Amino acid sequence: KIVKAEVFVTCPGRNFVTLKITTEDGITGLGDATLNGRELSVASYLQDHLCPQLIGRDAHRIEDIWQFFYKGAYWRRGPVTMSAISAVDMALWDIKAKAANMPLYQLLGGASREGVMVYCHTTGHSIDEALDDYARHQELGFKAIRVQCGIPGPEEQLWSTEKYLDFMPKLFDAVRNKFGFDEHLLHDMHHRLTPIEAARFGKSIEDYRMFWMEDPTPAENQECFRLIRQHTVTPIAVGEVFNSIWDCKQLIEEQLIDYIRTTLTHAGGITGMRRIADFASLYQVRTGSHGPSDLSPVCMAAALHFDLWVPNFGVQEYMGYSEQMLEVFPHNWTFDNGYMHPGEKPGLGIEFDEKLAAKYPYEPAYLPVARLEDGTLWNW
Amino acid sequence: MKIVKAEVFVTCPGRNFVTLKITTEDGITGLGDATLNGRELSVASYLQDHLCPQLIGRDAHRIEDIWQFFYKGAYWRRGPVTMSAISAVDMALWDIKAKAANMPLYQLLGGASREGVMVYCHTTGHSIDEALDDYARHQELGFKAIRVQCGIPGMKTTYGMSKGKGLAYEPATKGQWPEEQLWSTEKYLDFMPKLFDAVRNKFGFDEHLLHDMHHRLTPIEAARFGKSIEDYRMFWMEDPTPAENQECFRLIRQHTVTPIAVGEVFNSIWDCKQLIEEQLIDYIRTTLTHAGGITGMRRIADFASLYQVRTGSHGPSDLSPVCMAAALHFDLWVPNFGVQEYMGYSEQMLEVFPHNWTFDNGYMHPGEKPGLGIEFDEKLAAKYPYEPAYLPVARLEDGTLWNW
Amino acid sequence: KIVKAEVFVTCPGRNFVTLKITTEDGITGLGDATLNGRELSVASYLQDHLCPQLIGRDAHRIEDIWQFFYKGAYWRRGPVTMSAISAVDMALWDIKAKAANMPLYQLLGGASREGVMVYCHTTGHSIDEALDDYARHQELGFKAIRVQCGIPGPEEQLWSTEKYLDFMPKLFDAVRNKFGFDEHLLHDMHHRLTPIEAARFGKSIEDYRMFWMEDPTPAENQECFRLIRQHTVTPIAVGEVFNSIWDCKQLIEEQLIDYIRTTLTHAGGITGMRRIADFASLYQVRTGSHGPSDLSPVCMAAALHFDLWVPNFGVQEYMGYSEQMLEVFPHNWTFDNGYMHPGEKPGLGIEFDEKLAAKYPYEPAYLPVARLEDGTLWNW
Amino acid sequence: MKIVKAEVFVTCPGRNFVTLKITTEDGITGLGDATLNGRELSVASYLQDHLCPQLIGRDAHRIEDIWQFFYKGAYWRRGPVTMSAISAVDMALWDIKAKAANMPLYQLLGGASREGVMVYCHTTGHSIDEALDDYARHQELGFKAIRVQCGIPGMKTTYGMSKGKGLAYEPATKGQWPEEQLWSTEKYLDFMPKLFDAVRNKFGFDEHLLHDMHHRLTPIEAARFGKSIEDYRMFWMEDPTPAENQECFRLIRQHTVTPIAVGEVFNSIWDCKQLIEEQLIDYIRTTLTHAGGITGMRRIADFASLYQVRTGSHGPSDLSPVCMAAALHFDLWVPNFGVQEYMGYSEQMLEVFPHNWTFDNGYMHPGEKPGLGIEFDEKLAAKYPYEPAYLPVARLEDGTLWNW
Ligand SMILES: [Mg+2]
Ligand SMILES: [Mg+2]
Ligand SMILES: [Mg+2]
Ligand SMILES: [Mg+2]
C-alpha cells in the first residue's frame, strides 16, 4: 500500500523534478520526471493529477498502474504525460527490487554484460581544440567519444546546413589521422538536415567509419529516414525526443536505424522501455539511451540497471554531472576504464537528499532555438 | 502589435476551463482555449510557467513563427499537454488578427463555404424505449443529425453516487479518483445493433444517425460490428478501436461499408496521417483546442480533403465556448466540412463566456462580430475556483485495465 | 459585391494577361493569368466564361468562388483552366487584404522570415562567358545563382543529351574552382533527359554540391523520378509546368523531390498553392516557385507575400523584368543583398497602369520546341 | 499534302459546336471536333489564335509529329482546353489521311472487329412509373442497352425556368450563370436502388442496364451503393466519386462486384493510368474530342485492353456529329470495345453536319465513305452564331459547393 506520493523540484545548478513513493511498511522509491525546459508542467501533471490517484494503491501492481495512467489519461501519449508515467514506473520498480532484496538489473533477467560502455562529450571552437579535448577524454579512459566542433563562421542560434556539409567531415578526418581507429567515433547532427542532405552527409563520412550519426533529420515522419538509409552505410541513431514505441515503430521495423536512443525518464520507464528494447532486438537494432545532464542521477542509476541486462545493448550516453548536481543524489554506481556498473544495493541503489534539495529552489531555463540566416525558425 | 500581457485563467462553472488571454500594446484582446479534461492544471502550468513569459516581447502579428517557435522550440514535440498549450496561443492570436482586420474570423480563412454549420446532439437511455423518446425529444428540437446510445442490459453501475444516466454529458466526475466502469465487448456486439434497428423502424431515415464506440473493440470486433449495422446506414461509427497503431483500422475498412470517424484524442497530423492517406476513415474528429488551433487544424483538414475525408470536430462540454466559437468560424469556411458536434453548455458555463453564435433548425453560425465573437467575464470566472474532476476508466470482467 | 470583372492584355515587350476585379465600394484587386504562348486562350476563358459569372458575387467568398470555378467547370484541371482560376483567386485575396487594411502576407499567418532569398539567371556561349556572368551577378549581391552555358557544337532548337552529359559537369567544376562554395549553385535541365540519364547526371555533379537540379525528366508519369532518386544525392526540383497538386502528389509523397516549383499564376493562386505548400511540408519538401519574365509583376508581388509566410520556404526565382515591363505595373517590393520583401501597403501592394497598358497591343510569341538530330520532336 | 488553310467555326443550332476544318494544297478537306461544353470559346481561341497559324506550313501527312508538336510543344501539357484543341487537329488529320487513302477511317485503324457498334440510350422520369414507360419506349426502338435515371422524391427543382425533366439531354442552359441544383446523397442512397428493382421486375434481364452516378458520392458511399445494386446486375455504375485522386476508386473496388465506368471528364492517359493498371474500372469513357483524338485514344484503349478494360465512350449532345462519326470508326475497329453512348442529335443539329452512319436494331455503323464520312455545311452554320450556355453546379443542403 502506497501512503505518500511526493514531488520535489530542485536546481543545483540545473532543474530536476523527482518523484518519491512511500509504502506503508517504509519502503521508498525514486523516479525521474525531468523534462528539460518544461519541468513544472510535469511537476503539476504528477502533484495535481497522478499522485493523489496513487494513494489507495498496491505498489506491487506496476503493470496495472502503468496501464491505468497510460489509457486512463484518455489523451494518450506525449512528452509531459510520459515523463510523469515514467517517473511513477521508475519509483515502483525501485520499490519492487528493494522488496526483492535485489539490485534492479537482477529482476530484469540478470547481467548480460560485465560492464556498460559509455560515451563522453568532446567539443571545441576549432579542430585543434576538439583534438586536445578528445585526447584528454581518451586519457580519461572512455572507449567511445562523441565529437563536435564549431563551424568557421530561449537563446536563438544561427544555422547553416551548407557550411556544415562542406566543413564537418574535416573533423572526423582529423580525429582519425591523429588517433587511430579502435575508439568508437560519434556525432550528433541535432535534427538540422533534410533527408537527402543527411544521405549526402552519410556518404561523405563513410571513410571514417562512424559508430553512428545521430538525429540526422526530424523524425515525426519516420518515412523521412528512408532516403538516408538507401544512400549510406554510416550507422544511424535517433530517439532522444521520443516518448513512445509509436514514435519509432516504423523506423525500427523498416530497418532505418541502428541505435534507438529512447530513455527511461521520457519513454515509459522500465515497463515501456523494456517493450521498445525488445521490439528493436528483432531487427538487430541496439540501445543507445540518451544520457544528458537534464536526466537526473535517478535515471542514470535505473539506466545502468537496464543497460546491464538488455541483450541488445549498444552504448550509454554519459554527458556527466556536477559535483553540485550529484551531491543531492547519493549514488553507488562505479566507472572503470570506460565501463560503468550500477550499485549492488537493493533497488535502483539511489538516494535523494531532500534537505539539501530544499536549498535549491526552481529557476527557469529553456533550451535554445535555431534560426536560418533568414530568420526562419528551424530545428535546434 | 507587441504582446504586452499573456494570462492564464482557471475557472469552474461547473466543470473546469483553462483560458488564455493575450493583450496587445494598442489594447486588442484575444482569447484561447487550453482545456484538457482531467489534466487541466498541467496545461495551465505549461502556459503560465513556461511559454507566456516567452510571449511577452513578441509581435502578435507573427502567428506562424510563434506556432513553429513553440511547436519545434519545445524540443519535445507533440502530445496532449504541449498541443493544448500551443493551440490556446494560436487561437488567441487569430482572434486578435481578425479583430485587427475588423472581420469575423471565417472571413480571414477564405470566407464561407456554406450558409450554416450542421450540428449533431447526443441521445441516450437505460433501455431502448428511453432512447427512442430522447431521440423524439431532440428530433422536435430541429436536429438533423443525432448520435444515439443506450445501456447494455445487465450492465448498469452498482455505484450509488454515479451521475449515471447523466455522464454521457459530463463524464468527468468531481473528486480524486476516476469512476471505474465494467466493460463487456461481447454483450455490446449482441445488443447494440438492436438500438439502431428500433430507431430506424420508429423514425425512418431522413435523420443522420451517429454512434460512438468509445475505443472498446479490437479491429476484427469493430469489423463485425460495422457489418452488423450496415442496414441502418449510419452516418458514422465512431472511435472503433484504439488508434495509436493506425494500421489497426485496416481490418475494419476491409470488411464493412459503415462510415468511420475518429480523432477526438488526437493532437497532431502525425496521429492521423496514415489513417487518412490510406482512406481508413471518412471523418476526422480533431479539434482546435487539442490539435493545434486554427493554424494546425487548417493543415489537417486540407490534407484530409485530398482523400475525400470530411471534418467532424469533437465538441463536448470540456471544450470551452471559446473553442466552440472558434470551431464555428472554421466549420463555416472549411470546404470538406462534414458535421460539428455540439454538446450543450449549461447556462452557468455560458454566462462566463458571453457569446454571439446562433442556432436555427439544426444549423449553427458564429458571430458576424470581429475576431471569434466571444468574451471571458473575468469577474464571474473568479467566483469559480478549480475543482478536481476525472474521466472514468474501464475494466473488463477480468479486472483488466481496458480502453475507456 | 463585385461590380466589374475586367481582363486586359498587353505587351511591353512580352505578353501579359491581367484580371481586375472591382467591388461596389471601390476596392480593386489584381490577378495574373499569364500563360506563356497560349495567352489569348486564358483571356477568353476569363472574359467569355468566368468573368460574367463573377458579377452578382460577394468578394469575401474566396473559397466558394474557387470551388465554384474549379468543380463547376466540369472538365476539371489544366494549364488554361487553372491560369484563369488563379487570376480570380489572386485578385480576390488582393481585395480581402486591402479590406483588412493589411499587406497580404499578414493574412496568411505573418512573416516567417525577414527576407526572401531569390536566385538570378546566368548564361554564356562558353564557360568563360558564364564565369564572368556569375561574377557580376555575385557582385550584384545574389546569394543563389542558376548557371547555364552552351554545349560546344516556334523556333526549333537542336538537342543532344549525350553532348550535354559529357560536357555540363565541366561548368559546375569551373564555378566552384573560381568562386568557392558558400553561394547556392543551381541548374535547369529543361526536361531533356531519361530518368536513368538524370541519375547519371546527378551522380556526376555530386562533387559540386548543387542546391538543386531542376526538371530532370518529363514528369507526367511521376514514377519516372524514382530512378533518379535511388541513384543520386544531388537535390531535385520540379514543377513549373504543374497546375495541380494532382500533378505532384506522388513526387512529394514518395520523397522524390526536394523543391516544388509550382506558381501562384499557374497552380491555383493563394488558395491552391497554400494547400500544395502545406502538403509538401509534411515530407520536408520546400517551395521553389518559378519566377520567369512571363509571370507578370502581379504574381511576383503575391509570390513575395506567399514566400514571406511559408514555413517551408526554399528559394524564389527572380529572372527579372524590363524597365519597359515594370512601368505598366507600379510596384513597392524591395531588394537588398540577395533578399526581396513585398510592400507594406494594403493588399498585394501592386497597381496596373491601364492607359499605359493600352499603348501596347497583344503580339504573338511562342516558346521554342526541341528536336533531336533525327528531327524527333523532343521535350523543350 | 501541304496544309494551306486551318479554320475554326463556332455555330449554335441549338447548342454550341466548335469545328476545325483543315484544307490541303491539293484540296483534300478534313474536319475535327473541338467542342468543350460550357467553355467553348477558350478552345476556339486556343485553335484560332495559337495553333492554326502554326499548322500553315505543315505536311498534313505527318500526323504523329504534329500531335507531339502541339502536345509537348505547348510547354504546359495537359488539360481540357489544350486537349480539346489538339484532338480537333488530330481528328481532322485522320479524316484527311483516310480520304487520301480512299478508305473509311476504320480500315486504316486495322479494319472491323465487329459487324456493328452497340449503343445505349438514356431514359428518365420524375417518378419510377414514368421511368418505366420511358424504358418501354426505348425498348421498342430496339435499344439493347439502356441507361436509366429518375427523380429523388422531394428533390424537384423549385426554379420556374428549369428545362427540368429535359436537362438529362441538354444540361447546358442558355444564359450567363449556371443553374444551381440541390443534392442529398443520403436520399439517393435510400431511393435509387428501388428504380433498378422495379425495372428488372417489369422488364427482366435481357437488356443491358446502365446508371450514371454523376460524381456525387465518396468512395465508401459508392461502395455501399454498388453493393446495394448487385442483385440487378448493372452493366455498369458510372462516375461513382470524383476521380482526380485515382486511389479513391480502391474502396469501391474492394467492396462491390457491380461494374465500374468512368472517364467522361478525362483528357489524358495520365488521368486514368492508375485506375486501369490497378483494375479499378471495367469501362473507360474517354472521348476522341476531349482525350486526344484518334492518335491519343488508340493508346488509351490499347493500354486498357491489357487489363481487360473495355471502351465505353461518352457521347452526349455536346460532342458534334464529327466526333460521333469518328467514334463509330474507332468503335468498329477497337478490339476491347464495350458500348457506345448515343445521345440523339436534334434534326436542327444534324442538318449542319450531313452524315452517313446508320442505326439498325441497337447497332450503329459509320460511313463506307472515305475519311470520317461527315460534312460541315458552312452556309447553314453561319446562320447560328454562338450563344452562351453553361453546365449546372450542385450545392448540398448546406450551400456547400459540391460535385455536379
Ligand atoms: Mg541529439
Ligand atoms: Mg468519442
Ligand atoms: Mg525549367
Ligand atoms: Mg456521366
UniProtKB/Swiss-Prot annotation, chains A, C:
What single Pfam family name could you report for this chain, choosing any that match? MR_MLE_C
Q: Which cofactor does it need?
A: Mg(2+)
What Gene Ontology terms describe what this protein does at the molecular function level? magnesium ion binding; mannonate dehydratase activity
**Binding note for cofactor:** Binds 1 Mg(2+) ion per subunit.
EC?
4.2.1.-, 4.2.1.8
> Where substrate is bound, by residue?
N36, H121, E240, R261, H290, D294, E317
Question: What domain of life does the native source organism fall in?
Answer: Bacteria
GO terms, biological process: amino acid catabolic process; carbohydrate catabolic process
Active-site residues from the entry: H190 (proton donor/acceptor)
Q: Do you know which InterPro entries this protein is assigned to?
A: D-mannonate_dehydratase-like, D-mannonate_dehydratase_GalD, DgoD-like, Enolase-like_C_sf, Enolase-like_N, Enolase_C-like, Mandel_Rmase/mucon_lact_enz_CS, Mandelate_racemase_C
Residues under site feature: Important for activity and substrate specificity: P292
Gene3D superfamilies, from UniProt? Enolase-like C-terminal domain, Enolase-like, N-terminal domain
Q: Which reaction does it catalyse?
A: D-mannonate = 2-dehydro-3-deoxy-D-gluconate + H2O
The positions annotated for binding Mg(2+) are D188, E214, D215, E240
User: Which of UniProt's keywords are assigned here?
Assistant: Lyase, Magnesium, Metal-binding
EC top class, as a word:
lyase
Q: Does the keyword Magnesium apply?
A: yes
Similarity section: Belongs to the mandelate racemase/muconate lactonizing enzyme family. GalD subfamily.
Q: Which NCBIfam families does its entry note?
A: ManoateDhtManD, PRK15072.1
Functionally, this protein is described as follows: Has low D-mannonate dehydratase activity (in vitro), suggesting that this is not a physiological substrate and that it has no significant role in D-mannonate degradation in vivo. Has no detectable activity with a panel of 70 other acid sugars (in vitro).
Q: Report what the protein is called.
A: D-galactonate dehydratase family member RspA
Q: Which organism is it from?
A: Escherichia coli O6:H1 (strain CFT073 / ATCC 700928 / UPEC)
